[PDB]
# Entry
Amino acid sequence: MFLQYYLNEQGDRVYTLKKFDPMGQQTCSAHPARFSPDDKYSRHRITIKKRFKVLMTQQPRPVL
Amino acid sequence: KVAKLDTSQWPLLLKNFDKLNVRTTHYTPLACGSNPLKREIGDYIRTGFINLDKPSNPSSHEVVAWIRRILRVEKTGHSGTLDPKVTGCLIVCIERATRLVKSQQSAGKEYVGIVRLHNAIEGGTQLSRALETLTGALFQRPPLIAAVKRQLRVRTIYESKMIEYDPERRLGIFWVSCEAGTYIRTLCVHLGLLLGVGGQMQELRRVRSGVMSEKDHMVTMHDVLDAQWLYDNHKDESYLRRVVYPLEKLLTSHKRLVMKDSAVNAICYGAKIMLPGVLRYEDGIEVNQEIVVITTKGEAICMAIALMTTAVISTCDHGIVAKIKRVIMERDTYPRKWGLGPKASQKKLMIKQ
Amino acid sequence: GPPERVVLLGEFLHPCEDDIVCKCTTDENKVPYFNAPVYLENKEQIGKVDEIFGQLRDFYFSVKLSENMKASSFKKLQKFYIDPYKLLPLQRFLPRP
Amino acid sequence: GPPERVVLLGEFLHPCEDDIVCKCTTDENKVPYFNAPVYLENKEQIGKVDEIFGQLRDFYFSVKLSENMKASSFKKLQKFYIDPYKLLPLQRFLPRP
Amino acid sequence: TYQELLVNQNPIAQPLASRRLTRKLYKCIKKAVKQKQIRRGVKEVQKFVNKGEKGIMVLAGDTLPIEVYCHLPVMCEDRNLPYVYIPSKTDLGAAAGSKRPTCVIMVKPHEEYQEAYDECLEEVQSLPLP
RNA sequence: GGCCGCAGGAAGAGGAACGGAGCGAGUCCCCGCGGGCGCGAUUCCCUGAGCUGUGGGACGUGCACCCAGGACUCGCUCACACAUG
# Structure
């Protein structure tokens, strides 16, 4: 849809309409991916998120 | 290594516990509870919530229905409705965390939306001024439902900000901080009337729900499904323990009152919080104020209403510190240890003798 | 029919998409009923109150005009009047003591 | 709820079969609505207007009393008050020009 | 120009095609679109990988969020289908004669461009795997 | 500061379970929720200037959603707890 964003230097979302940020990188869509409850590709997403070290379990653990 | 950690780095409701006022340091510990982060995965989910990033097609009641299929639980609540096409922060409380839903639903929200204007304006400054006009306590007509005309009502907008404006498409991003139950679709209509050109809310996203935001701990519906799958097929809790968080994370703003292990079960059965069982108590407890009562392991026992101030607790030696509002913890998590104390023993002895 | 008397409701600001936006200036900051008939001082009905918006003590209202009326007709700071019975006190919308 | 103000409706005459007959004394000889709430000057509802009868310019009305009220309570020439919006002008009942 | 698009790549966008291989893949897509022998959406590509239709699956390496298409790499590895990433989604759409972008295309084999298809296929299978 | 009048008191300061909880029901509050999801066949159609391939539609078809809370009121269960130096 219309809302895009890019991250500033302290990790906050900076919302914008424009497809490119002030440093020339592409802006992400603000909205998450569309979900289906009948999705059967859980194995597949874990498989390659593990491979490229971007699964949620492999990130730095949050400070609570 | 816990000995090296400063008390400011202790988790959840035990954070900065040394800066609470100490009534007494002595009690008898009991091997009953756990720290909320180390609850057995079943109990962890039943006392937990999800900071969900809601997708853009389904209704908010459909989303929490999907969560309760996946996790295989009987009860969920959801911190205020997002309309089917709206995304963003939706705190989904699971099972025993549904006792907190009123506190989450009544909390202050934040939104990032797009208003589309129906004719050209002078520039971005003109839209920025119309937003300043619609700050503070505003009139808003609640929409018609089942042909029941709800009356005009007041809702506060704390802050507003004009983030960007595009004169080509006549689109303007706005950020709004506001009271619960504010209609942002209605705000964009009023913003259009005030400019004179007309307008509609093109798009919306909720970026904050009280204590939780999109900045940290937020997860998508795929993570929820994916984490459950990993637990079902490989018996790995790791992913679920990053999707679900314990309900104590929702209560970190409240003033705390730490209780002895003897008192815990009594309070779960519906006893009033008495002063002989208080170990520690926070600065800035007022009368008729909602406080969280916790164990020495940082578990939430109940939401309580304080009948003594901080200063009053310091002077007295007995009596009702607080009454229960809602009990969070189950009965018989801790054993029954009431009636064993000196004055209570003397009472029972002198009745018998 | 035409009411016995009418009280000052508000003054004309800019038009907006074939209805007229008006700053509310009632005595005691009273609030009009939804779909309350709006009159000129001659007791001729120009329209009905559609929207009510803005801050509690400085609020506006739009007027959905009548069949025969046009939004171009009205001048700046032209006053409009309402039947005093379909006003409500501000205290109703303020919080309970 | 309780109205913002109340105008003089009429004065107490004799009771009649557990409701109260009252001589109407309105300004401009205005006529009350049927089942219009009748108040005392303290803005407490005593009953509702049941009957309206007599000559046009010297008319009476009976008041069907409230659940808690009794017809013995009221004294002679005690005044009663009505919400001014559920009055009508006498001209309505007078013939068309 | 190519090195500027390399900033926008995903965490999961490997193996990325070489600058010349990217050019070969676009020219193969143009010929396949003319012959009516491609599939464009995730919706489509997912459907025909399930049916077991063979082809080179070309992915856009700047697709975000990754959840929309990150299941497809493993769907290919289950069936031994050859897949490869390319720098941008806009150019992948532009290769198929479209102004709007697309995150994935599957090129089917055909007689009219069989030699170009085999040249691309050979280099795709030869890529180093992460 | 002083004087007069009216009104409230004529006060020794008590009480280490008071009078609670958890469920269920009825009634209010909350309450923009036919839409959402999947598969099938003529690649099911479609890069529409129509949103749209990170999705839009047609026809078959199936599927799961429309609560959870709070307040008042009348039940059932568990306690009636001053927290063991």
